[PDB]
Design an enzyme around this catalytic site. Sequence first.
Site, mmCIF file in Angstrom:
data_model
loop_
_atom_site.group_PDB
_atom_site.id
_atom_site.type_symbol
_atom_site.label_atom_id
_atom_site.label_comp_id
_atom_site.label_asym_id
_atom_site.label_seq_id
_atom_site.Cartn_x
_atom_site.Cartn_y
_atom_site.Cartn_z
ATOM 1 N N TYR A 155 0.524 -1.271 -0.171
ATOM 2 C CA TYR A 155 0.095 -0.315 0.333
ATOM 3 C C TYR A 155 0.736 1.316 -0.072
ATOM 4 O O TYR A 155 2.109 1.613 0.522
ATOM 5 C CB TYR A 155 -0.836 0.126 1.481
ATOM 6 C CG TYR A 155 -2.512 -1.021 0.949
ATOM 7 C CD1 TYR A 155 -3.223 -0.874 0.260
ATOM 8 C CD2 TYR A 155 -1.773 -1.852 2.422
ATOM 9 C CE1 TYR A 155 -3.922 -2.078 0.404
ATOM 10 C CE2 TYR A 155 -3.427 -3.003 1.981
ATOM 11 C CZ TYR A 155 -4.167 -2.760 1.097
ATOM 12 O OH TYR A 155 -4.742 -3.439 1.255
ATOM 13 N N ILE A 211 -6.910 1.691 1.890
ATOM 14 C CA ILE A 211 -6.312 0.970 1.920
ATOM 15 C C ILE A 211 -6.806 -0.488 2.898
ATOM 16 O O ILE A 211 -6.259 -1.504 2.858
ATOM 17 C CB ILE A 211 -5.005 0.919 2.136
ATOM 18 C CG1 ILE A 211 -4.880 1.747 3.609
ATOM 19 C CG2 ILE A 211 -4.462 2.136 0.913
ATOM 20 C CD1 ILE A 211 -3.053 1.736 3.780
ATOM 21 N N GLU A 259 -5.555 -2.103 8.675
ATOM 22 C CA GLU A 259 -5.824 -1.865 9.706
ATOM 23 C C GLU A 259 -4.988 -0.385 10.020
ATOM 24 O O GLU A 259 -3.918 -0.982 11.012
ATOM 25 C CB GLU A 259 -5.477 -3.130 10.253
ATOM 26 C CG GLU A 259 -5.937 -4.372 10.288
ATOM 27 C CD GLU A 259 -6.221 -5.017 11.032
ATOM 28 O OE1 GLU A 259 -5.497 -5.338 12.034
ATOM 29 O OE2 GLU A 259 -6.948 -6.289 10.606
ATOM 30 N N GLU A 318 -11.146 -3.125 -2.769
ATOM 31 C CA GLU A 318 -12.075 -4.648 -1.817
ATOM 32 C C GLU A 318 -13.215 -3.808 -1.436
ATOM 33 O O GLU A 318 -14.312 -3.034 -0.600
ATOM 34 C CB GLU A 318 -11.704 -4.947 0.022
ATOM 35 C CG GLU A 318 -11.032 -6.261 -0.185
ATOM 36 C CD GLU A 318 -10.609 -6.435 1.781
ATOM 37 O OE1 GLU A 318 -11.042 -6.056 2.143
ATOM 38 O OE2 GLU A 318 -9.889 -7.643 1.111
ATOM 39 N N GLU A 347 -4.405 -11.383 -1.742
ATOM 40 C CA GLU A 347 -3.898 -11.425 -0.177
ATOM 41 C C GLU A 347 -3.665 -12.524 0.500
ATOM 42 O O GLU A 347 -4.801 -13.359 -0.182
ATOM 43 C CB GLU A 347 -4.953 -10.748 0.229
ATOM 44 C CG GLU A 347 -5.060 -9.314 0.022
ATOM 45 C CD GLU A 347 -5.862 -7.946 0.553
ATOM 46 O OE1 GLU A 347 -5.990 -8.335 1.867
ATOM 47 O OE2 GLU A 347 -5.943 -6.604 0.293
ATOM 48 N N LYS A 373 2.781 -24.765 9.947
ATOM 49 C CA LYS A 373 1.854 -26.142 10.049
ATOM 50 C C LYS A 373 0.772 -26.213 8.688
ATOM 51 O O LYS A 373 0.276 -27.439 8.106
ATOM 52 C CB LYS A 373 1.991 -27.151 10.609
ATOM 53 C CG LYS A 373 4.176 -27.387 11.427
ATOM 54 C CD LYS A 373 4.641 -27.764 9.827
ATOM 55 C CE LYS A 373 6.186 -28.625 10.537
ATOM 56 N NZ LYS A 373 6.513 -29.046 9.347
ATOM 57 N N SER A 402 -1.432 -32.756 6.617
ATOM 58 C CA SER A 402 -0.275 -32.192 6.195
ATOM 59 C C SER A 402 -0.833 -32.560 4.707
ATOM 60 O O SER A 402 -2.299 -32.741 4.273
ATOM 61 C CB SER A 402 0.657 -33.264 6.383
ATOM 62 O OG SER A 402 1.837 -33.029 5.799
HETATM 63 C C1 GYP Z 1 -12.043 -5.463 6.552
HETATM 64 O O1 GYP Z 1 -12.340 -6.313 5.654
HETATM 65 C C2 GYP Z 1 -11.482 -7.204 6.054
HETATM 66 O O2 GYP Z 1 -12.109 -8.144 6.698
HETATM 67 C C3 GYP Z 1 -12.853 -9.121 5.588
HETATM 68 C C4 GYP Z 1 -14.010 -9.497 7.189
HETATM 69 O O3 GYP Z 1 -12.716 -11.068 7.739
HETATM 70 C C5 GYP Z 1 -12.559 -9.633 4.732
HETATM 71 O O4 GYP Z 1 -13.327 -10.690 4.309
HETATM 72 C C6 GYP Z 1 -11.596 -8.563 4.081
HETATM 73 O O5 GYP Z 1 -10.959 -9.663 3.101
HETATM 74 C C7 GYP Z 1 -10.566 -8.286 4.985
HETATM 75 O O6 GYP Z 1 -9.258 -7.185 4.430
#
Ligand code: GYP
EC number: 2.4.1.391
Lengths: 706, 702
Positions: free
Chosen positions: A47, A94, A97, A171, A338, A353, A698
């Site tokens: 981003y 973007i 978070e 998204e 992603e 794993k 696995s």
């Molecule tokens: C706020 O969006 C985020 O959380 C949602 C809910 O889990 C996911 O579907 C998405 O890919 C992710 O970018």
Amino acid sequence: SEKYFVKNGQPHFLISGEVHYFRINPKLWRNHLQLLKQTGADTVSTYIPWDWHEIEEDDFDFEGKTHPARNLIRFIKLCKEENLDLIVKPGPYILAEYENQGLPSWLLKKLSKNAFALDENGNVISPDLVSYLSDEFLEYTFKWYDKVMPIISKHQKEHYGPITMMQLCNEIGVFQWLSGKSDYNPKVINLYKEFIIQRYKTIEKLNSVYSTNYNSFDDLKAPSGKIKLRSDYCAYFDFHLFFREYYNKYISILKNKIRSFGINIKLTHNIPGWIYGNASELPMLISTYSEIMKNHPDIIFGLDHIPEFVSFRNAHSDLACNKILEAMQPEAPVWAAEFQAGTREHHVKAYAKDLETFYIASLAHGIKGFNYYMFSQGINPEGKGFYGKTFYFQTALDAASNKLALYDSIKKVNRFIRKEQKDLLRTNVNSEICVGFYKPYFFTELISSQLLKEKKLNVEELGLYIDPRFLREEILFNGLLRGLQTLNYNYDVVDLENCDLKSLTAYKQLWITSAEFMDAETQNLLSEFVLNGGNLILYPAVPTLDNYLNRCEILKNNFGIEFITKDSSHKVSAFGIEDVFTAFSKKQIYNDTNSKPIAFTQENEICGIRKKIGKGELTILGFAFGYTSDEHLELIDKLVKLNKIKRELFVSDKDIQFVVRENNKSRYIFFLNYHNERKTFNYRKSSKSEEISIAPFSYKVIKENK
Amino acid sequence: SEKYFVKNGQPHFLISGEVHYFRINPKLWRNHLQLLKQTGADTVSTYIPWDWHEIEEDDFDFEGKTHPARNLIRFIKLCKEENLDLIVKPGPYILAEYENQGLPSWLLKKLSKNAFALDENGNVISPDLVSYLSDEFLEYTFKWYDKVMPIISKHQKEHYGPITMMQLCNEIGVFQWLSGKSDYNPKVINLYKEFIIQRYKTIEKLNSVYSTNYNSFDDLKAPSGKIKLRSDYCAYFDFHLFFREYYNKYISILKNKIRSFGINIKLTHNIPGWIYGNASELPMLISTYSEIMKNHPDIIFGLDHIPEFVSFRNAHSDLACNKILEAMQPEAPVWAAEFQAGTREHHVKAYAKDLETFYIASLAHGIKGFNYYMFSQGINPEGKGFYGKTFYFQTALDAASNKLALYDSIKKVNRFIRKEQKDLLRTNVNSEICVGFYKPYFFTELISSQLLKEKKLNVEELGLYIDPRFLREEILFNGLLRGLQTLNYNYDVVDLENCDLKSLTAYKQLWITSAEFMDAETQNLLSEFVLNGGNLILYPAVPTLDNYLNRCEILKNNFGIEFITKDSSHKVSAFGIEDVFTAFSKKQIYNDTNSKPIAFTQENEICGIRKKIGKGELTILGFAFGYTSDEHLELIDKLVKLNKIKRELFVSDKDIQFVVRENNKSRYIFFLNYHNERKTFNYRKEEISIAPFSYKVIKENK
Ligand SMILES: CO[C@H]1O[C@H](CO)[C@@H](O)[C@H](O)[C@H]1O
Ligand SMILES: [Ca+2]
């Protein structure tokens, strides 16, 4: 016939890693890029946050003048020095978070109320949720583009820079989804009114379809509140159609602006929909992009895969999502924009794993490229973290560039991919089953979803009994597609919209999960399919209505079907399987004319038949089943065997999953153990057996020459 | 001080297996029982379905006259021959995925409409859902008891038969939970009106509490639909209290009928609430039994544990349930009446290697007995299954008594339990942390639940911002309790209702998760606790209302607290931890006179203080956090360390969970790896490897 990325006229497996320069000490950027390159990755992805670079209104820093980690120009130059191609994602959203989902604090404080997404009462849904086509929002978005896009243009591959791809925004609609509160902003409601006038031309035509009594288009209001009447359902159906055009207008405006800077690289968008480790709602979100994918053959959509763990509980999510993207985007490779690496949430662990198995399963399941998200952990500078200081955990590299446990998993998978990509990208699976994707059953994000606050759609109030979300989640996604994958029968998914009959004729069976409604075009297509020689499996209903719940009996009449809908016990018998639990008391009871009755209610009334129609075959079951019992897998197996379809392998443990991928040179056998058991089994090709031991959760991969 | 089952005057770990005779070929009954005994199990458990034995009205078959699997008498005799004790569960409801939930088809066809649970319009809710206090339902139940109860009575241990315990009905109130719908049968509503008249005496007193405008009790209608007004919240709160009394009336009628046959064995009930492998709703179901638990010291409630898998995703659920049951039922052992073995659902796998680790974790987490449900798979006779032909999958034995993978795991765990039971049952954990259970926050099954799709409680419409279900699920169950368990700090839970001040003084901290409302008795209790020398941690709100949302500021005034509620960024700083994400924009901003500020909003307003009050200590945080970031674990760890509480062990890997269980002589260390990673670690008050999703138990002599 496979779609895959190409570099210098050869198949190329796109292996990217996400590295957020803005969340890493710039003295360590080079070490992150070197360690990513050393896994065999060819690309890095980041981003470019609007908030980070437009530090106050009309004050831009891309050079690290005010904070060293604002030196985007240096990060681009380092990607080129370390022989990595670069994906850039400048927003305007973007998410990531990042505080305010990437939008500048100064912007959200300055915008007037009419820039925001509004509920029907006119209140702001969220202080960081703008209205996409807000005039004010787009003016400031364009001023951000005026500064970041010349940099991106200068550093494109065609000018010997590292940039190969750019994502538009992030998204689209993920916020109209994660509140299910939809946007009633007046710019939006006015565009909706224009859409309705263009669609119907006269209020008399709209009234004839909806069964309403409006005197003029000025009387028509945007739908809100619960659906109580068939006319409410019609209004919301068109409102869903309108939102698909609205998202296409938004991405069209961004694309036209970007192209004006001489940016000719590949444009991308990313599909949300996983939550809590399954993706049964993702098909609803991808359906919101239907008008973008029709209008923009040059924008490649990739998946955002967030499995969280890797077990039988979610094994079917990634394959069903890969197949549904291929159905809606058949001319581009299936890729993950992603591709989970580490975890966004400290309390939601991501085990190396588990993810290593997910990566190999994704190869079995036809993925052609991916971007590990997050390859590198970050630390938010300057309080920018939405939810805390640390961005991602259990990644390949920590923020300091130390290798963590996932690093060796990614190196292992990448090594196999680089060794095999020339053959593996050209492999197909032999699918003799096609499953139909009927997009209108998915068009419910305003009225019926796992996330929406208020259930607005109650089909029983409309005199219906088959809910389209129940059908598409439990009968299709968690039912049929889960069942076929569990039984190791290969399937393809095809979009029924403008579907060429000649695409469908290659399959031994077409499976259609139907509600009581289906448009005339699709009822006609399925009629022609069977008359011309196709074998059709259709349940739980012969449809009798169109998308506006008006009479449409085309398929029923073309198949010579007569039925009555009657209440009985949930249990039926089918093909000699007793006590098949079905979802509804109501069932279709077929008269036996020119047919073989193959399913019976508790009162021995006929609730399934098989018949020969023209050159084709029809199997109709007037009852609903997903996969909630062993009888359901026995029934799917019986239906597949009606046309003598065979698995590629005999495998001694029915709980082992496998995929055979092959081209003319090479055969790859992928074995997947989604279960917490060490399994010892034997196998052989359907046309001396080999013994295999596989660990819990696995995988094994076998390559055969020829 | 521990509560445990006893056999021959010594601690006894109750190991039972559920084996449904009515779903197994009777030629194979002996083989199932022999294979159960050979695992070290001491008891076998089954329903006795009313539908299966009263085959038509007043025609009873307990001897296999009409179907060999109706030979209840032979199965009881085999239990005794094979040296197993027997738990019997004769309903009238059994659920058990049995047609009509165990009620006879002939009964449901014959009952008048007024015998059924009715919606607010007087329509039958479901053709298999009776009204618990219907005269006609209880008359037919009594005629069933008149035939089955003399058989049970004759076969008690007292009379060297095998029967040691009996369950009354099955998961009382479960249908109101799953649907979110209450029974509006006029007989129920008349009992509700009597409850309200009894509670308030006069329409004037009810009007003063609810802020209603009734001229008499005749004006009063049972609450229904969404809560729009504070008076609707009041009416629904008492409707919840009413149902808790109504369930006590029902189980009391069954209990007294049973005791009339000289049945003196232990009587049981069972608690549901697990959903998709976590149990954050189960405390709401415990709360429905509040009046039964207060009035019946002699009925032992056990838990229905359905983890489905065993990982960090659900590691906290079973401990929190066991601790809350101990709080509500302190004089009986904590036991699992239904202890997952195999899976009810073919598509929801139950791995032997997961469940083995769940069984050992359950010992770590204080379980004193369990009944493997289902030890033996069944085949539904004669289409009598609600669902398909088969009842359960991946069990210890299939319906034909074939051993499956789970058999050897159960035999291994049972061998360990028998070896250790005399000492292990007498062990406890040393809890220096007490967490308050405030039952009124849980009284919401008709208005706010994980199962109720259309929410009737919207606290913002009432001028409130802290929703009690959000608080109890995210801030308490999945936040504080998950965090303490993850950090390896022992906690106990205490029922705040009629709570003994002397019991709270053993602990170094009491943690209270508070909404904006709390009754005067609990406000006074917490006041006295701190003034007498207690250390109280209280968040996210100082309450200012009672259970009827009428002013009650006892705790606020006794502690000299003043605050304004103000909107700010979700993130705060607390105890020098930056970027602590909190659930609400609205926060309490505290006057800090005579106080130390310890938490700050993005603009440095005071949203947390510490204070000395009398001999005690107060820590108030005016913000809500659960466990959704590493800062949240850092903050819980800092709060625990305010009163110098220490973990028992230093373990080099923070993601290993441990439990130290001790008595004067014996110490058990339970190490639990809830992660898909082989982990190697060391410990001290010595270097060990534990497989993924696995365990290790160490014994130390003291
Ligand atoms: C706020 O969006 C985020 O959380 C949602 C809910 O889990 C996911 O579907 C998405 O890919 C992710 O970018
Ligand atoms: Ca004061």
